[PDB]
Amino acid sequence: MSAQFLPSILVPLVGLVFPAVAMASMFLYIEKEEI
Amino acid sequence: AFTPPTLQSDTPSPIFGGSTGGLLSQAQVEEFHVITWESKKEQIFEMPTGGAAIMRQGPNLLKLARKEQCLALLTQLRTKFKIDGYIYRVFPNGEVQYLHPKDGVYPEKVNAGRSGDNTNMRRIGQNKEPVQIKFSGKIPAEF
């Protein structure tokens, strides 16, 4: 496939960075007291 | 001619060895309840939190978490030892609010002078249809 390096960067981004960021943001938002 | 009796902090507590089913951290930041009764003799009774305590001869005070625990203990005292008690609600700031025997007369007995709160003058099937109160944060029972 063209640009074999792309999956090695996108898979961890969508499975590790994006989920951690999304969970942290959701946790901080669902307990804001004043949204 | 009835006035809520004040809560005396000098009332001794029943003889109990301690248990893990007592007050937690909610009573420190939210509220707790206190039940005070008068016993004619020192006798063993069952606590709502588990175990057995001994109520002293005279005034007894017991602090519990929920109001249901106090009411259960009062029911046990009324149906087993024929003892009448008073329940109060205490807040962390230090405010005491009288509860259960609100007007000195038990709720099962009519007192003539209470508030007829939440008493519809219709039948259960005479409520408004759910489609007639759509887009309104109310149920058919509140009309």
């Binding site: - | 508030s115 939440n118 519809n120």
Partner: protein, 80 residues
Amino acid sequence: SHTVKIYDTCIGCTQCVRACPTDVLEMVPWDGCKANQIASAPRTEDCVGCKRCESACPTDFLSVRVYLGSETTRSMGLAY
């Protein structure tokens, strides 16, 4: 905080009041039944929703109804 309602079909038997475990109902004077008393729910904030009052009502249909709504620290029966 549940919604407790009393209807005119009540006969003033006072069974629902005796069956309440949190002291939410009480009997007040009335003139629509032979008992000359009706049930009321002045302390609905302490109602937990056990529906014990409905299991004790002898009228058909029930004269006392409990509609579970917004849950609070008291309605959920939480001691912690």
